[PDB]
Design an enzyme around this catalytic site. Sequence first.
Site, PDB file in Angstrom:
ATOM      1  N   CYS A  27      13.181   1.571   3.533  1.00 63.15           N
ATOM      2  CA  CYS A  27      12.731   2.003   4.851  1.00 63.15           C
ATOM      3  C   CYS A  27      13.760   1.645   5.920  1.00 63.15           C
ATOM      4  O   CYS A  27      13.412   1.262   7.037  1.00 63.15           O
ATOM      5  CB  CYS A  27      11.372   1.399   5.191  1.00 63.15           C
ATOM      6  SG  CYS A  27      10.065   1.786   4.008  1.00 63.15           S
ATOM      7  N   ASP A  30       4.441  -7.759  -7.300  1.00 56.29           N
ATOM      8  CA  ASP A  30       5.111  -8.227  -6.095  1.00 56.29           C
ATOM      9  C   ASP A  30       4.981  -9.739  -6.016  1.00 56.29           C
ATOM     10  O   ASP A  30       3.970 -10.310  -6.429  1.00 56.29           O
ATOM     11  CB  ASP A  30       4.541  -7.590  -4.827  1.00 56.29           C
ATOM     12  CG  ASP A  30       5.491  -7.688  -3.647  1.00 56.29           C
ATOM     13  OD1 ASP A  30       6.556  -8.325  -3.792  1.00 56.29           O
ATOM     14  OD2 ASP A  30       5.172  -7.135  -2.575  1.00 56.29           O
ATOM     15  N   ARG A  33       0.433  -9.795  -0.080  1.00 60.61           N
ATOM     16  CA  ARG A  33       0.595  -8.362  -0.287  1.00 60.61           C
ATOM     17  C   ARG A  33      -0.166  -7.887  -1.520  1.00 60.61           C
ATOM     18  O   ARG A  33      -0.696  -6.769  -1.530  1.00 60.61           O
ATOM     19  CB  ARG A  33       2.078  -8.017  -0.395  1.00 60.61           C
ATOM     20  CG  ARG A  33       2.898  -8.506   0.788  1.00 60.61           C
ATOM     21  CD  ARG A  33       4.057  -7.578   1.098  1.00 60.61           C
ATOM     22  NE  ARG A  33       3.801  -6.769   2.283  1.00 60.61           N
ATOM     23  CZ  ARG A  33       4.590  -5.792   2.707  1.00 60.61           C
ATOM     24  NH1 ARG A  33       5.697  -5.468   2.060  1.00 60.61           N
ATOM     25  NH2 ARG A  33       4.261  -5.124   3.809  1.00 60.61           N
ATOM     26  N   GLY A  91       0.825  -1.188   0.000  1.00 63.47           N
ATOM     27  CA  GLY A  91       0.000   0.000   0.000  1.00 63.47           C
ATOM     28  C   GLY A  91       0.863   1.241   0.000  1.00 63.47           C
ATOM     29  O   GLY A  91       1.998   1.205  -0.484  1.00 63.47           O
ATOM     30  N   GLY A  92       0.352   2.342   0.543  1.00 66.39           N
ATOM     31  CA  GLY A  92       1.170   3.530   0.677  1.00 66.39           C
ATOM     32  C   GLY A  92       1.568   4.150  -0.645  1.00 66.39           C
ATOM     33  O   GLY A  92       0.771   4.852  -1.278  1.00 66.39           O
ATOM     34  N   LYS A  93       2.826   3.927  -1.033  1.00 68.25           N
ATOM     35  CA  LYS A  93       3.366   4.527  -2.249  1.00 68.25           C
ATOM     36  C   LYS A  93       2.529   4.174  -3.472  1.00 68.25           C
ATOM     37  O   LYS A  93       2.369   4.999  -4.379  1.00 68.25           O
ATOM     38  CB  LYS A  93       4.812   4.076  -2.446  1.00 68.25           C
ATOM     39  CG  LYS A  93       5.712   4.352  -1.254  1.00 68.25           C
ATOM     40  CD  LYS A  93       7.162   4.027  -1.565  1.00 68.25           C
ATOM     41  CE  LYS A  93       8.000   3.999  -0.299  1.00 68.25           C
ATOM     42  NZ  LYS A  93       7.466   3.030   0.695  1.00 68.25           N
ATOM     43  N   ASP A 103       7.673 -12.139 -10.428  1.00 71.74           N
ATOM     44  CA  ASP A 103       8.906 -11.872  -9.698  1.00 71.74           C
ATOM     45  C   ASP A 103       9.608 -10.652 -10.280  1.00 71.74           C
ATOM     46  O   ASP A 103       9.799 -10.555 -11.498  1.00 71.74           O
ATOM     47  CB  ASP A 103       9.835 -13.086  -9.740  1.00 71.74           C
ATOM     48  CG  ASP A 103      11.185 -12.812  -9.100  1.00 71.74           C
ATOM     49  OD1 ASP A 103      11.264 -11.944  -8.205  1.00 71.74           O
ATOM     50  OD2 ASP A 103      12.171 -13.471  -9.488  1.00 71.74           O
ATOM     51  N   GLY A 104       9.998  -9.730  -9.399  1.00 70.20           N
ATOM     52  CA  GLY A 104      10.712  -8.545  -9.847  1.00 70.20           C
ATOM     53  C   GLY A 104      12.055  -8.871 -10.472  1.00 70.20           C
ATOM     54  O   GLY A 104      12.485  -8.210 -11.419  1.00 70.20           O
ATOM     55  N   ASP A 144      10.777  -0.340  -4.590  1.00 70.92           N
ATOM     56  CA  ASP A 144      10.785  -0.349  -3.129  1.00 70.92           C
ATOM     57  C   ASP A 144      11.086  -1.774  -2.679  1.00 70.92           C
ATOM     58  O   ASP A 144      10.196  -2.577  -2.398  1.00 70.92           O
ATOM     59  CB  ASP A 144       9.460   0.161  -2.576  1.00 70.92           C
ATOM     60  CG  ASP A 144       9.476   0.299  -1.068  1.00 70.92           C
ATOM     61  OD1 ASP A 144      10.530   0.681  -0.517  1.00 70.92           O
ATOM     62  OD2 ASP A 144       8.435   0.027  -0.432  1.00 70.92           O
TER      63      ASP A 144
END
Lengths: 52, 41, 95, 327, 95, 137
Positions: free
Chosen positions: D253, D147, D152, D128-130, D180-181, D198
């Site tokens: 983070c 992701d 998630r 979430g968030g960004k 997969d990233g 991120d």
Amino acid sequence: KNILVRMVSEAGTGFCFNTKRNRLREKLTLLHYDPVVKQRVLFVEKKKIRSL
Amino acid sequence: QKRREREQHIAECMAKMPQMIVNWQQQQRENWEKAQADKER
Amino acid sequence: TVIVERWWKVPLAGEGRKPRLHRRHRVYKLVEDTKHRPKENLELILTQSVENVGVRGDLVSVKKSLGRNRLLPQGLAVYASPENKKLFEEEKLLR
Amino acid sequence: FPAVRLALQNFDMTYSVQFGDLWPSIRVSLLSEQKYGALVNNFAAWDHVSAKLEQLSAKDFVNEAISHWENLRCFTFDRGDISRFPPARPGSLGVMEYYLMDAASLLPVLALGLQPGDIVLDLCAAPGGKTLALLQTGCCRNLAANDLSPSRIARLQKILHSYVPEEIRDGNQVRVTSWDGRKWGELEGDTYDRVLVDVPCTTDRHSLHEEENNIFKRSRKKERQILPVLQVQLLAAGLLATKPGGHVVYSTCSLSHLQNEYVVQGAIELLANQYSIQVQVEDLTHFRRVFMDTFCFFSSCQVGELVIPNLMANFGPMYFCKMRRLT
Amino acid sequence: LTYFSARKGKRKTVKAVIDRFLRLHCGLWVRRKAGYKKKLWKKTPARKKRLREFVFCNKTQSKLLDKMTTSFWKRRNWYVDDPYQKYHDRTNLKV
Amino acid sequence: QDINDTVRLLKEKCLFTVQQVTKILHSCPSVLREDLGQLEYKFQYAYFRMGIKHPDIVKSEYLQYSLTKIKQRHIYLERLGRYQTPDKKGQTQIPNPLLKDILRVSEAEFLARTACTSVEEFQVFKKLLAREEEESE
RNA sequence: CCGAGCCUGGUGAUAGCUGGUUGUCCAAGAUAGAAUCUUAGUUCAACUUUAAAUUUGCCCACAGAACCCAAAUCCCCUU
RNA sequence: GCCUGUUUACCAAAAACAUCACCUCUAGCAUCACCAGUAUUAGAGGCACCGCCU
RNA sequence: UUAAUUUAUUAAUGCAAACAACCUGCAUUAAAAAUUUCGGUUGGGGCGACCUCGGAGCAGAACCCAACCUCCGAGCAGUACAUGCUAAGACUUCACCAGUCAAAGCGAACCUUUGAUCCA
Ligand SMILES: [Mg+2]
Ligand SMILES: [Mg+2]
Ligand SMILES: [Mg+2]
Ligand SMILES: [Mg+2]
Ligand SMILES: [Mg+2]
Ligand SMILES: [Mg+2]
Ligand SMILES: [Mg+2]
Ligand SMILES: [Mg+2]
Ligand SMILES: [Mg+2]
Ligand SMILES: [Mg+2]
Ligand SMILES: [Mg+2]
Ligand SMILES: [Mg+2]
């Protein structure tokens, strides 16, 4: 989260049935079938039964 | 006495019921219209 | 007085028979202690003038402590029995 | 030994050296409560919610930032103020009025420079968030978010159902995948114009807060040790997916210099040798000066920007680095 | 269970069985379904309909219940308006 | 009864010698006004969480200071990392600041020499800690 | 013969553990799933035995059983 | 290990236990112990004779 | 012992009871105790991890199964508030418990991840 609530008939009958609504969401008013009256009638949220 | 009290209360609520249902549906529809008006801005 | 009650009910014994008690029948719960009840008053008939209570022949509700410690032991008062009430009634009507 | 205590030991043995005299302030800020910003939903009564927050005395730090930096509106309280924001509730339109999120997890979005009509990638960002911040930017921009974690991804779907209307969510404007990233570089290449990477991090504040699934627990030592490799691979994959001349923002983070600067440097090295692709780190010093009022920044960081938590503004941690793929 | 009680020498009935099962005289045991009152809000209507039903027991379950009850519970009862009066007997049964 | 239960709390549940109890009463009779339970919490905060011993608790009149002030300064120091609870061996990686340096001094010197932080940060921390205590209770 | 004396009694303590369990002869008689403070046990199932009722049972030739992208197995007219 | 002593009767006599010495804690007191005593007292715990340098 | 359960008994207090002492009852806090327990898998131990359910590997062709094991996620969320009531016939995680599907009928409208009993 969600909470189980007791929607009570607005038709004067003692018929109540349980639904789930978000805690942050407003108190519920919903059309539902009344078996005793045998007709769709409004139901209002009375009290919070639990927090699920 | 209990049976007739229940019957008369049910009859009164049934008399009020169609008007209440119409008012509630109208309220829902007008809330939707207000939402679309806000979307219009 | 301590008043107690069985936790476990005792089966009925019958008419001439005596109840048979077991280990579980010796378990009690205190239902009340009479000493913690609110105090009541004793009815007495006075025989001699006593300050702030009465003079003679008048039924008085006095604290049990006073009635049993001062009035009755010293003869200043007598029990409000039917006999005493009758005797003092005859005294009143003869005066 | 609680994993919280283990994380405290590791932070004391590393960030103390990293930050010198600022470490006590960072430590007390992390151990104290977190300051939450309120990001109004652009898909709701934005004006009414903004007025309500201004009545609640919060101010939109984003509003008086773009003027100097050159739709996003996040209200945060003044420095020192510890007032909480009222819990989010559904709006008149049927969507949540605002999202209570870490205001620091918004500088990568504002630094990516979302231009109109630009294709956007969220390589691994799915808490979430960004992601919601990127969505609440314009009605003429296409975004795809990926992701590895199905949980998630489901969390993204729930928050999108809560905030983004059905009309916007259903269309191709939003594309939620779960691949997969690392293999994203082979799935697509030179496709996205703006990318946000991120990577999973030590999430220092949450590591010190929650014992559950704490990265510093003895079980997850292998994951914590392989984190640099995973982060470098993900950033390289994002730099591969971005178009030549495109922009990416690496986000973390964590306070760890290892996870902040060595990751970007190693990604640059690996993607310039193994792939012969040149990437230039863009300066964000103007960004630092613009947001100095609302956030406290560590200046000694050579590459990228580090928003450190302070008692006055308990908004960090957040490291973000802007990288333009010159080739 | 108690095969020979200490006071009468008789076989005892497991009252947990009586509180839970109904015995039809022919030898069938009826019961409720477990969980038929539990968390109905999270059960589908078909599952609730299945749970609200009165259900027969196995042969071995019935044999166990027969062993756990005494002959008193296996007698003909001519109750006034017994809902199970028709179910107390089997009809058109081949072996 | 109030005086006796204060003394009995000091001796039995706090393990203060008779001389120490006399010294405490002589130095700061406000202990008698302070209610039980709160006094025990203050003492156990000094003993377990702060790692202080009875001789030091008596020497520096810790029981005189308010629990709110004690927590406000101690938790600030601990989260700053300048104060460490002694281990099972009773040792610390860094020597802790003295109770006189923590509580006896004013806020100015307390934040300038022991904490080495800013008064604004301390005020924010104090408000945050007040919120934390209110939420906990 | 004391990490808690001795004697008597409760007491034929309890023991999912060890050991033992006595005429003749015949017959049927095999490894097996689940749950369990459970894997040294037990209960249900399967198998097993006896008695009883009834009518099909086993073997199987074709036909038949999936897309993703081997040996065989299942099923049953005959026999 | 200060010393003389004590201990696992029946595999350990010791560096273990005790011990003078010292320290700490508790107690302001009568007719059954302590004690027919009273703070230079009594009870409990620790330590180890002693002596020096800090 | 910072395992669980107690405080009958003492010792303190408090409140009632008897008119300060002494004593009874009821509470609260302690001391001293008392009673009782020691789940399972992994050469052992430390630190672990796991224990239920569902999906995939893992079984090439009915089912069943490679337990132990690998990965993933669920103690739900969204939706509707007939997403009701009834009812032939069936399936089934090799027992039971439990769990599934369902014609016909009645009635409204015109679904996609767990836990028994007792007890409250
Ligand atoms: Mg009789
Ligand atoms: Mg002997
Ligand atoms: Mg035996
Ligand atoms: Mg044979
Ligand atoms: Mg069990
Ligand atoms: Mg066994
Ligand atoms: Mg010697
Ligand atoms: Mg000798
Ligand atoms: Mg010997
Ligand atoms: Mg010898
Ligand atoms: Mg499977
Ligand atoms: Mg089955």
